[PDB]
Amino acid sequence: FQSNAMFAWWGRTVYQFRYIVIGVMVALCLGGGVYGISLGNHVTQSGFYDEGSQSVAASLIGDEVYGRDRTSHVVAILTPPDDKKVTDKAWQKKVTEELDQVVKDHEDQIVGWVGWLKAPDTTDPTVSAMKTQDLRHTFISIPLQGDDDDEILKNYQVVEPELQQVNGGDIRLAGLNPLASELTGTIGEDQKRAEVAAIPLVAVVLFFVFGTVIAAALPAIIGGLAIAGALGIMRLVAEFTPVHFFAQPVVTLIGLGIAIDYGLFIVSRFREEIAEGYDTEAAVRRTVMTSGRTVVFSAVIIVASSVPLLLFPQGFLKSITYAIIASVMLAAILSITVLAAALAILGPRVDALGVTTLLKGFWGRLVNVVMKRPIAFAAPILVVMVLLIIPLGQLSLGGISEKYLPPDNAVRQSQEQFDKLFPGFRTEPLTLVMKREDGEPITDAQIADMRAKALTVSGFTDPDNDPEKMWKERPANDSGSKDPSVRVIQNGLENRNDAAKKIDELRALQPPHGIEVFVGGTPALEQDSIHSLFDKLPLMALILIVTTTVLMFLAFGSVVLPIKAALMSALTLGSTMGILTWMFVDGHGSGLMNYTPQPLMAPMIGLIIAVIWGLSTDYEVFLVSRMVEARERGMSTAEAIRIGTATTGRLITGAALILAVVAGAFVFSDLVMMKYLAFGLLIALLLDATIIRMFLVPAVMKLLGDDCWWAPRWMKRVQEKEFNIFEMLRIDEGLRLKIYKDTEGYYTIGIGHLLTKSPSLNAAKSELDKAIGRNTNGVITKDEAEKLFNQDVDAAVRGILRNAKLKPVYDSLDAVRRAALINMVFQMGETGVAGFTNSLRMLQQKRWDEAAVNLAKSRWYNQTPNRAKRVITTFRTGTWDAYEFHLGGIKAFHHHHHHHH
Numbered sequence: 001f002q003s004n005a006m007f008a009w010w011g012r013t014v015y016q017f018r019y020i021v022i023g024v025m026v027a028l029c030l031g032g033g034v035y036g037i038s039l040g041n042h043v044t045q046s047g048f049y050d051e052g053s054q055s056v057a058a059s060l061i062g063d064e065v066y067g068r069d070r071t072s073h074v075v076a077i078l079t080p081p082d083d084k085k086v087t088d089k090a091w092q093k094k095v096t097e098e099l100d101q102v103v104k105d106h107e108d109q110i111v112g113w114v115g116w117l118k119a120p121d122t123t124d125p126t127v128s129a130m131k132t133q134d135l136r137h138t139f140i141s142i143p144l145q146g147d148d149d150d151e152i153l154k155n156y157q158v159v160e161p162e163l164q165q166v167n168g169g170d171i172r173l174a175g176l177n178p179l180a181s182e183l184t185g186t187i188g189e190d191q192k193r194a195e196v197a198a199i200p201l202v203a204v205v206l207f208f209v210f211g212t213v214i215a216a217a218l219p220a221i222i223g224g225l226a227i228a229g230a231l232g233i234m235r236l237v238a239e240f241t242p243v244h245f246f247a248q249p250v251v252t253l254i255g256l257g258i259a260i261d262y263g264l265f266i267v268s269r270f271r272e273e274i275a276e277g278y279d280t281e282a283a284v285r286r287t288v289m290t291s292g293r294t295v296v297f298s299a300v301i302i303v304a305s306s307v308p309l310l311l312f313p314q315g316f317l318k319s320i321t322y323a324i325i326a327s328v329m330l331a332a333i334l335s336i337t338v339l340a341a342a343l344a345i346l347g348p349r350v351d352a353l354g355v356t357t358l359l360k361g362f363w364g365r366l367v368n369v370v371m372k373r374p375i376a377f378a379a380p381i382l383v384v385m386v387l388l389i390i391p392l393g394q395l396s397l398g399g400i401s402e403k404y405l406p407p408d409n410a411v412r413q414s415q416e417q418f419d420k421l422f423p424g425f426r427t428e429p430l431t432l433v434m435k436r437e438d439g440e441p442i443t444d445a446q447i448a449d450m451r452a453k454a455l456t457v458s459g460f461t462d463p464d465n466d467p468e469k470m471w472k473e474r475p476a477n478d479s480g481s482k483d484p485s486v487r488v489i490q491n492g493l494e495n496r497n498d499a500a501k502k503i504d505e506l507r508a509l510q511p512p513h514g515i516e517v518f519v520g521g522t523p524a525l526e527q528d529s530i531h532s533l534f535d536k537l538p539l540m541a542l543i544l545i546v547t548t549t550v551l552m553f554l555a556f557g558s559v560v561l562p563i564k565a566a567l568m569s570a571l572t573l574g575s576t577m578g579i580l581t582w583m584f585v586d587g588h589g590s591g592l593m594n595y596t597p598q599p600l601m602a603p604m605i606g607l608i609i610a611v612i613w614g615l616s617t618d619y620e621v622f623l624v625s626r627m628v629e630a631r632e633r634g635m636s637t638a639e640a641i642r643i644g645t646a647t648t649g650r651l652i653t654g655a656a657l658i659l660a661v662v663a664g665a666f667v668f669s670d671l672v673m674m675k676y677l678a679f680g681l682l683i684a685l686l687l688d689a690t691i692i693r694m695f696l697v698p699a700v701m702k703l704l705g706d707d708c709w710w711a712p713r714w715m716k717r718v719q720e721k722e723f724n725i726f727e728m729l730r731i732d733e734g735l736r737l738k739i740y741k742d743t744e745g746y747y748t749i750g751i752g753h754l755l756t757k758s759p760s761l762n763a764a765k766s767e768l769d770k771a772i773g774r775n776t777n778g779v780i781t782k783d784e785a786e787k788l789f790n791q792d793v794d795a796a797v798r799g800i801l802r803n804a805k806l807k808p809v810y811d812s813l814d815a816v817r818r819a820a821l822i823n824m825v826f827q828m829g830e831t832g833v834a835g836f837t838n839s840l841r842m843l844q845q846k847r848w849d850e851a852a853v854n855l856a857k858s859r860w861y862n863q864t865p866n867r868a869k870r871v872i873t874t875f876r877t878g879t880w881d882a883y884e885f886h887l888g889g890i891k892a893f894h895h896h897h898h899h900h901h
């Protein structure tokens with residue numbers, strides 16, 4: 001695999017061009033934000049159905065031929081004031097004139113207004129039922145113009161202000177368009193609730209995590225930039241494919257928390273790079289190379305968890321998937337570009353401004369408890385979660401209704417009043433759409449055939465008990481082509497819960513010869529959508545689990561840890577969905593959170609499965625990979641677990657808290673779908689950030705310490721060669737496999753190995769042949785140069801340990817800093833290095849910063865600054881990082897002291 005090849009280059013590059021990166025990407029994000037403000041006028045409310053289904057075809061054909069039903073666009077209940085009754089002919093006259101005026105003013109929007117009030121002397125019984133028995137309320141129907149849902153809704157919102165002022169305001173609007181206006185306005189209301197309640201809370205959590213103003217501010221800015229760029233991208237996407245309303249809040253509910261968490265992790269990694277003594281440029285490079293990789297892998301995991309949603313046919317789920325993908329990918333891009341560039345500019349200045357600026361280890365021991373006795377905690381945790389799965393099996397599913405809004409919502413209440421006062425009018429029948437393959441008309445006899453065949457099916461509502469009084473032809477209006485080759489008949493259902501059966505029965509009827517039959521109606525559309533979701537759930541789950549487990553094996557290098565992860569994520573998923581059913585189907589929580597218990601939107605369960613699985617996988621890989629890394633750390637115990645939970649404890653709690661703040665803003669949504677999604681997010685977050693991270697996954701995983709890392713893998717993951725003193729000096733003194741003359745004109749070879757000060761080259765050839773034990777012809781191989789160099793360092797170390805000024809400082813140093821001191825000795829002699837009494841003593845006392853600052857003041861640094869700066873930063877950090885990423889190549893080769901023979 002390709003660990004750290006491209007990320008090192010990018011880490012050099014962002015420091016190299018921090019200014020234009022921070023300019024270009026900020027320009028892009030702000031331009032995208034401006035462009036994406038227009039999103040909201042280019043979003044759709046459609047997307048809940050299966051557009052390949054037979055119900056949708058029945059809808060398309062029936063609307064084309066009979067005209068779309070616009071009778072439920074807008075119902076308006078009028079109550080005459082001052083206890084006057086609908087038969088008051090003066091009140092009648094004035095409201096007629098008002099309605100006619102608004103219609104005349106809005107003929108681009110209103111087809112007309114229809115009702116009993118238009119013919120109060122009529123004898124039509126259905127029209128007569130448009131007034132109450134007490135003569136105190138009468139409703140009218142106001143069909144609107146337009147040829148998709150969104151255009152109709154916009155027309156309604158255009159005419160609604162003037163329509164509410166009719167009858168002195170004593171008019172109550174209901175039907176599909178007032179409800180759709182309310183349901184789609186919930187989006188913006190949730191937006192501003194997040195703006196006012198979550199941004200300050202994220203600010204306090206950020207400042208608590210960091211402690212200084214700038215460090216806390218950077219992730220907030222990164223999140224804002226991500227929000228803006230992602231809204232821009234979604235608008236651009238809207239130019240080509242339709243984008244559902246619900247896609248806007250998802251950008252900020254899911255995306256904003258992820259953006260900020262990425263930012264915060266990068267910033268804390270940068271700060272700990274600084275605290276370890278690294279250059280700002282080295283810091284930037286190493287944070288992108290370490291934490292940028294895991295940020296990007298998190299992005300890959302979230303995208304991998306989201307893309308299986310694209311199997312489902314609902315445009316709703318597709319728009320949400322696009323939004324998730326756009327948000328998280330931009331968040332990763334921003335975190336390793338804008339943020340890295342900013343940090344490259346600031347350097348250590350990120351900690352400058354402290355708490356006072358006014359203008360307007362606990363982990364480790366808790367895990368040792370679970371560790372020393374695990375099963376006593378694993379078992380009850382593992383059974384409470386299954387008895388939270390038990391409510392799952394009951395789940396109810398249904399379509400959109402007035403009850404998606406809160407009970408105290410005025411529009412929902414106008415709908416409920418209309419249904420209480422005029423019960424017969426709101427119907428959702430099943431349609432039989434008959435289409436002739438040939439274009440010739442359908443005869444009356446063929447309709448009689450289909451009519452009888454339909455009569456063979458039970459469970460269909462029958463108002464009047466008459467064979468012919470059933471399955472009436474659908475009404476035709478002016479918008480319909482009236483094509484004779486297709487005719488529709490319809491009838492309502494007896495039991496609303498008997499639809500799926502009845503539809504199937506209606507689909508099993510052998511239709512007449514030469515015709516094709518599509519059965520539609522709202523129950524048909526809803527049930528077909530549900531069938532599509534239930535039918536694609538297996539493949540979606542399979543791809544989800546297989547992709548995530550493969551990613552997790554890449555991350556873990558084990559075949560048991562990803563399987564454990566998969567099943568614990570499935571387990572918290574089942575548990576959290578059980579809780580959700582407990583709250584939103586059975587209602588435990590309904591009174592406090594102000595929502596109506598009801599079935600759930602069917603695409604919501606696919607959305608929530610993908611979302612919860614993704615979150616579980618993300619948090620679990622972040623927690624577990626730093627326990628599996630403990631082999632770079634070399635500690636073989638199951639103590640990997642304790643250090644991995646302790647190293648990532650504060651970080652996980654901060655990230656979880658920030659996302660929890662954002663989702664807690666959204667649990668208060670007037671839209672029960674949004675409530676259910678935000679709540680699922682919150683429940684999964686608290687389940688994975690506490691009960692699974694802190695208690696379970698130490699427990700079940702101590703059941704297998706050494707049996708879990710790379711348990712059974714043949715060839716698995718290559719370990720990079722550790723750097724050494726040979727490579728260090730090969731950089732500093734060159735490695736030459738043929739004799740050459742150094743700056744002083746002397747015959748040198750290998751790594752700074754003087755052969756002789758003789759002018760005779762063949763004297764050097766003789767000496768090199770003597771040293772190597774063969775006639776070399778003045779050429780050696782790299783391994784021979786390596787052995788010659790090892791002999792030179794053995795001589796150097798002998799000399800160091802015999803020197804009273806160097807032996808103490810040398811003995812007190814680790815292997816890397818010892819190699820730095822030996823480097824100094826090679827370059828300048830024991831005596832030379834021994835002149836650094838102050839510096840050497842600071843090194844002996846592990847005062848790395850003081851020693852580095854003092855050594856930088858030397859004439860050694862002045863005459864050979866690049867080599868000296870490499871050695872000095874090696875003394876600082878105690879690592880090989882200054883050599884694993886150094887400046888150019890050397891040009892002046894000088895043989896070192898302590899050349900051995």
Ligand SMILES: CCCCCCCCCCCCOC[C@H]1O[C@H](O[C@H]2O[C@H](CO)[C@@H](O)[C@H](O)[C@H]2O)[C@H](O)[C@@H](O)[C@@H]1O
Pocket residue numbers: 045049056059060063067068069070147148149176179180183184187245246400
């Ligand atoms: C942010 C969340 C917002 C959620 C709020 C949405 C709740 C209100 C929904 C309004 C739906 C109006 O439904 C009434 C219409 O239903 C069908 O047609 C609809 O379904 C067909 C097949 O899909 C499409 O071809 C038609 O274009 C499409 O109008 C009927 O054929 C139309 O005669 C009837 O007028």
Ligand SMILES: CCCCCCCCCCCCOC[C@H]1O[C@H](O[C@H]2O[C@H](CO)[C@@H](O)[C@H](O)[C@H]2O)[C@H](O)[C@@H](O)[C@@H]1O
Pocket residue numbers: 071072075114115118119122124126127141174175176179402425426427
């Ligand atoms: C989730 C949201 C759910 C929303 C549920 C709301 C459902 C509302 C459905 C209301 C439909 C009632 O309107 C039906 C009216 O239309 C037409 O009028 C005609 O009546 C007489 C001749 O029949 C004359 O007065 C006119 O010349 C003529 O126009 C029809 O011929 C009648 O059947 C009926 O009068």
Ligand SMILES: CCCCCCCCCCCCOC[C@H]1O[C@H](O[C@H]2O[C@H](CO)[C@@H](O)[C@H](O)[C@H]2O)[C@H](O)[C@@H](O)[C@@H]1O
Pocket residue numbers: 237240241242322325326
């Ligand atoms: C960061 C993530 C960004 C992801 C962005 C993905 C945007 C997808 C662009 C197009 C929608 C993809 O889905 C396929 C879509 O094609 C349709 O229209 C098309 O109808 C014919 C069918 O072949 C074409 O020939 C037309 O050219 C074409 O307009 C509609 O658009 C969607 O109802 C439908 O699903």
Ligand SMILES: CCCCCCCCCCCCOC[C@H]1O[C@H](O[C@H]2O[C@H](CO)[C@@H](O)[C@H](O)[C@H]2O)[C@H](O)[C@@H](O)[C@@H]1O
Pocket residue numbers: 001002003004289290291292293294295296297300303304307554555625
């Ligand atoms: C459907 C989605 C379509 C996208 C295309 C699929 C591409 C699949 C992989 C993409 C490569 C992106 O980088 C993935 C890299 O990240 C991982 O992180 C781990 O090493 C990081 C560096 O320290 C830290 O994250 C943690 O150590 C630890 O998590 C590892 O480095 C490697 O597994 C991999 O090299």
Ligand SMILES: CCCCCCCCCCCCOC[C@H]1O[C@H](O[C@H]2O[C@H](CO)[C@@H](O)[C@H](O)[C@H]2O)[C@H](O)[C@@H](O)[C@@H]1O
Pocket residue numbers: 193197198201406593594660661662663664665666668669
């Ligand atoms: C876990 C870490 C922290 C998690 C939480 C983070 C902060 C989230 C809370 C921010 C505001 C809290 O609620 C404020 C909301 O409630 C009131 O209205 C409604 O309150 C209930 C339904 O919302 C019902 O009483 C009524 O429908 C109606 O009165 C306000 O008027 C709304 O404008 C505001 O939206």
Ligand SMILES: O=C(NC1CCC2(CCCCC2)CC1)c1cc2c(F)cc(F)cc2[nH]1
Pocket residue numbers: 254258261262265294295298301302305610611612613614615616618619622652655659
């Ligand atoms: O917090 C979500 N990851 C966390 C994982 C922990 C981080 C990993 C990188 C270093 C800092 C910690 C970042 C944030 C998260 C995942 C997720 C998902 F897959 C779907 C979804 F809808 C919401 C999600 N949130």
Ligand SMILES: NC(=O)CN(CC(=O)O)CC(=O)O
Pocket residue numbers: 835836837838839840854855858
């Ligand atoms: N680190 C050094 O170069 C020490 N030098 C420089 C100094 O500290 O003044 C003095 C000494 O010879 O002890």
Ligand SMILES: NC(=O)CN(CC(=O)O)CC(=O)O
Pocket residue numbers: 732733863864865866867868889890891892893894
């Ligand atoms: N030739 C170089 O760039 C390095 N120079 C010295 C330096 O400036 O670091 C020679 C040496 O390593 O002693």
